[PDB]
Symmetry: D2
Subunit: 122 residues, 4 copies
């Protein structure tokens, strides 16, 4: 739907983010991580602002992967929160939170944080 966001993207780790930005504000696609307790593709879903500001600001968005697929389950989920900055060197700039299922006793060490920059492969 939104042609700028829709496509196949890679981040600095070489993970592959395949997404469609639909007329309804949804992000729908698959994610394949180059790192971590992950193999092959995982379902993702998210949302984006389908009417962004016309003042040069980016388009806010986010999405989630739960790290379960037909062949592995890491008992974990990542959410990416960020913005799409369009134009000739378009980027999706994010920060993310990866929470693993833990006992309450280990909950203090349940969540990793980082940042991913995605560039379109297209």
């Amino acid at each position: 739907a939104e042609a700028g966001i829709t496509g196949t993207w890679s981040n600095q780790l070489g993970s592959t983010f395949i997404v469609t930005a639909g007329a309804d504000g949804a992000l729908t696609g698959t994610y394949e991580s180059a790192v971590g307790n992950a193999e092959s593709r995982y379902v993702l879903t998210g949302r984006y602002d389908s009417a962004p500001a016309t003042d040069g600001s980016g388009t806010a968005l986010g999405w989630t992967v739960a790290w379960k697929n037909n062949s592995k389950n890491a008992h974990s989920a990542t959410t990416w929160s960020g913005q799409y900055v369009g134009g000739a060197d378009a980027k999706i700039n994010t920060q993310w939170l990866l929470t693993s299922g833990t006992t309450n006793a280990n909950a203090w060490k349940s969540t990793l944080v980082g940042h991913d920059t995605f560039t379109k492969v297209k």
Copy 2:
């Protein structure tokens, strides 16, 4: 299955109405008690539909883009956390709220916090 589906509230008084699909999907609406928000917003997310059997929580996350028919804050929040069910269920999360900005102001684009939800 999971016990996630239902109406939840957090420490701010916001309302999270969610349905957990058998496939790992989360769907529903979010209404914030605070910020540049009015009425309900669509959410989508994912959860681990086959959690560990060892007393660990269930990983999950979801997104809201803060545009609805009433208002658009040009921002989006993601919650990442764990669910524990049963009669005193709780969802314990950390969240990232990114506002659209120019690249020069990206350093001040993202708030971080933590929300605890209980079932209403």
Copy 3:
């Protein structure tokens, strides 16, 4: 002045022993109840020594590098948050715990969480 100086504990049972200098400095020791840590570690930090007068909290933060004479976890935590004093004082924080890693593993170097401290 501020009321920060003292012995504090968090929800994990860790102990934060701090002195607030008149110049904005924080000094003292931290003992974690969890993780790759034993005994006391040095901390340093800073706080706003001239906070607003409007009922806002006092911004502060501090660092611990997890090396002492007993153990070295090759990691460091920073807490960033706000202090409210008085008889039921609390320090509400978010924290980032970075472990040294190679560049290939920097994506998994940093834990994030939130600690609430009360005075012992």
Copy 4:
């Protein structure tokens, strides 16, 4: 003291981080931000691992600025948590938390998060 960490660094915003890594594990210096509610230099203090692993891992560290100096007070503090990766293109890679003093009612919006990469000017 530690010559690799000690020096004058700039980040991607053009802020200037002047630091000494002392034999006692302390970081001591000043910070000048290119952005935000800030002017001139602010005191910083922090800590670093003075005996890092010899396996190629970085050197963990962190520091704090409270945004009060002789001429402005933002009623806020930032902490940077990260690691120094030495060698010919040395970097200090961080994530940070900027908490502002707020009322309890506004505490939900008290804290910004981001990431800074510092390169040595020397």
